């Protein structure tokens, strides 16, 4: 489901802390990993009483636990205290977050590459109406590593690449992030790649 978003976040911060992210500022999912055992997720919204959250489990390669908070408790610009307690009673994780400060958008889609230079076009994250406040980043790699990394600002959905070597197979990908400083978070997962031979 949200497998690519969890893989990107895990690749950024690691499995040694409680990873939480939101996709459309109306949801919130917190997850972590273990090399079995049982845990108890609990949260406090402002001065409202503590509330336990239902935990789900799934194998990886390790065991990943997660909790999806009720929509009624995903308010922004508000202190949300999170606590993960082991079944042994031992404290594991303790965080105080704001929903708007953990934004991880869905990966951009509909990426298409054509020759003109090379022009790149894509579509903003699905069901994400903040398109005007979304900044992007384009990766250009070869068979060499990542040759170019281009920043796209102001909600633009078009990119024109320059200085590309001829007779070379380039792979392009685009990630998304919240542009406005009022939001914190992480880059989206990379889009499905598109190849082109100059």
């Amino acid at each position, epitope marked *: 489901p949200k497998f690519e978003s969890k893989a990107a976040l895990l690749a950024a911060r690691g499995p040694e802390e409680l990873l939480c992210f939101t996709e459309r*500022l109306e949801d919130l999912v917190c997850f972590w990993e273990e090399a079995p055992g049982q845990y108890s997720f609990s949260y406090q919204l402002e001065d409202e009483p503590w509330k336990l959250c239902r935990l789900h489990q799934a194998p990886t390669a390790a065991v990943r636990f997660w909790c999806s908070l009720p929509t009624a408790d995903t308010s922004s*610009f508000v*202190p949300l205290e999170l606590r993960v307690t082991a079944a042994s009673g031992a404290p594991r994780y303790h965080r105080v977050i704001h929903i708007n400060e953990v934004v991880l958008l869905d990966a951009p889609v509909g990426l298409v590459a054509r020759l003109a230079h090379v022009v790149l076009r894509w579509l903003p994250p699905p069901e994400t*109406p903040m398109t*005007s406040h979304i900044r992007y980043e384009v990766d250009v790699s070869a068979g060499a590593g990542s040759v170019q990394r281009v920043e796209i600002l102001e909600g633009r959905t078009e990119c024109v690449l320059s200085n590309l070597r001829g007779r070379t197979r380039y792979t392009f990908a685009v990630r998304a992030r919240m542009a*406005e*400083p*009022s939001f914190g978070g992480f880059w989206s997962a990379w889009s499905e790649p598109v190849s082109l031979l100059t």
Partner: antibody
Amino acid sequence: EVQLVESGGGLVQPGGSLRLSCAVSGFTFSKYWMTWVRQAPGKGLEWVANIKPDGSEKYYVESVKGRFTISRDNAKNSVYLQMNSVRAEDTAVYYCARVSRGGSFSDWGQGTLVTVSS
Amino acid sequence: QSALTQPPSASGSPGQSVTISCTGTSSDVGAYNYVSWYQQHPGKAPKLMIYEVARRPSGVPDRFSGSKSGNTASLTVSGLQAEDEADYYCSSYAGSNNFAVFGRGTKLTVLA
């Protein structure tokens, strides 16, 4: 239960300086955003500036950017609005407010008046 | 001050229902659900009546309610009272440099 009190308002000559204070009590002050909203006499409401709970980041409206400076004290539970290089278009009633859920302003202060020439 | 589009005036007899519109762009209202409504009596400071489009603070009667469609939000008071005759502002997130863009303001008058 929540109480907000502004002070330090008054007349200031064009190009002068004035510092507003906002005494806050009734809630965990160091956990919420704080904002300033002014209202020109007979006009509507305008967002001036806001500040993060830890006061690490500050944001301003374009008309006051580089002239005003917002700050906070999470020990005295106070919010300040430093006004340098004041203009005539700054004449308004300045309210300090607590930013809550959904970026709304839950609690407002009585408000203080700042008048500048015209 | 650049602001959102709000009807300048509105009137209604006690018992009636009044709906105040609030139109923005696709970068604020319709982009975020950070829509708020406020009530201001003469000489007094604004009071939060509606937050997050429809949600409502403790102390505010259910008679007030909000909605959102496209780029236009709407506040509605169903059971009009004399104590409701005041100014009503709408707000919305429009960026870090515009954390709350208010409307022009609406003077609601109870004609008795």
